[PDB]
Every structure is written in C-alpha cells, then in structure tokens.
C-alpha cells in the first residue's frame, strides 16, 4: 500500500521464487535417483 513497501514486496517475491526453485530442485533430484533405483531393481529381479 506504499511505494517503498511495494519495492520491498518485489524483492521478497523474488526471494520466495528462488526458495521454491531450490525446494523443487531437491524434489527433482530425489525423483531421478528413485527412478534409476527402480530400473536397476526391475532388471535384477528378473535375473534373480
């Protein structure tokens, strides 16, 4: 509701975007690891 307040909110929104990008990237890394595990287990089960 004020000018400098508006610019501060701009900066806070930029920060929040960065934070959510970091968290989503963590999720993505875990997901890729799980996918590789699942492929390897699917093969090893057939061999066993």
């Amino acid at each position: 509701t004020t000018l400098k307040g508006a610019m501060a909110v701009m900066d806070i929104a930029e920060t929040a975007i960065t934070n959510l990008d970091q968290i989503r990237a963590d999720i993505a890394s875990i997901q890729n690891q799980v996918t590789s595990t699942i492929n390897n287990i699917t093969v090893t089960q057939v061999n066993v």
Partner: protein, 46 residues
Amino acid sequence: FRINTNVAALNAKANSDLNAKSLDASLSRLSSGLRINSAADDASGM
C-alpha cells in the same frame, strides 16, 4: 525349456514397460507443449 518360470516373458515385460514409460512421457510433452512439465527432467533448466 523348463516351464512355470518363463524368463523371456519377464524380460519382454520389463522392456515393454520401460518403453511405455517413454511413450507416456513423450505424449505428455506433446500435449502440454512444454519440454519441462514435472520439473523432474531438468531442475536448473526450470
């Protein structure tokens, strides 16, 4: 030549399942129109 533990069936099933996964991913990209949908295929790109 021993039956009740068909191995070719399991092998073909695993391969076809992997291929179905790839087909589903390609179709989802074709639908949404974006190369990064789930953000799990490219983190820094996203």
